[PDB]
């Protein structure tokens, strides 16, 4: 589980939202795995906009925070899992590390902040929905 809050959004995996999220809905995209929900209050988090390439992200599995390289946003073909049939993901970048169902919503930030939050995993691998290209997060 795991939000990015920045301004009066809530960034979180489209497969974890609430019914609170869809009935207060800014905008959804199943190929990325993102739905944005608006809040009452104001968020501490700040988005990235650069195109780095190397970060640290959060992984519940193992409460630890750990340094990567990953690659650049693309479409990557994901494998079949409890909420998506193995389907082409946009968006997407991957980087070597554990990760399991339960660590989706985990933060991935650089040195500008937040990048995107984890999505996908297998086979040693984690993948992250990139936001630093969702510029209207920012202002609204
Ligand atoms: C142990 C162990 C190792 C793994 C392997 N990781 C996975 O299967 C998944 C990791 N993430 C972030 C996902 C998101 C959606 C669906 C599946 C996964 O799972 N349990
Ligand atoms: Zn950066």
């Given at each position: 589980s795991?939000?990015?809050?920045?301004?009066?959004?809530?960034?979180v995996?489209?497969?974890?939202?609430?019914h609170?999220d869809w009935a207060?809905?800014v905008?959804?995209?199943?190929?990325?795995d993102?739905?944005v929900?608006?809040?009452?209050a104001?968020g501490c988090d700040?988005?990235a906009?650069?195109?780095?390439?190397?970060?640290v992200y959060?992984c519940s599995?193992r409460?630890?925070?750990?340094?990567?390289?990953?690659?650049?946003?693309?479409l990557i073909?994901?494998e079949?899992?409890?909420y998506?049939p193995?389907?082409?993901q946009?968006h997407?970048?991957?980087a070597?590390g554990?990760s399991?169902?339960?660590?989706?919503?985990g933060?991935?930030r650089?040195?500008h902040?937040v990048?995107?939050?984890?999505s996908?995993?297998?086979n040693g691998?984690?993948?992250?929905?990139?936001?630093?290209?969702?510029?209207?997060?920012?202002e609204?």
């Amino acid at each position: 589980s795991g939000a990015i809050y920045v301004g009066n959004y809530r960034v979180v995996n489209r497969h974890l939202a609430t019914h609170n999220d869809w009935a207060n809905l800014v905008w959804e995209d199943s190929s990325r795995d993102l739905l944005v929900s608006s809040t009452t209050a104001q968020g501490c988090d700040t988005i990235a906009r650069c195109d780095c390439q190397t970060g640290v992200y959060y992984c519940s599995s193992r409460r630890k925070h750990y340094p990567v390289s990953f690659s650049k946003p693309s479409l990557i073909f994901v494998e079949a899992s409890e909420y998506y049939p193995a389907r082409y993901q946009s968006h997407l970048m991957l980087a070597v590390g554990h990760s399991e169902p339960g660590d989706c919503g985990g933060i991935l930030r650089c040195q500008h902040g937040v990048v995107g939050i984890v999505s996908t995993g297998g086979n040693g691998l984690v993948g992250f929905a990139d936001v630093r290209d969702l510029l209207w997060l920012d202002e609204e």
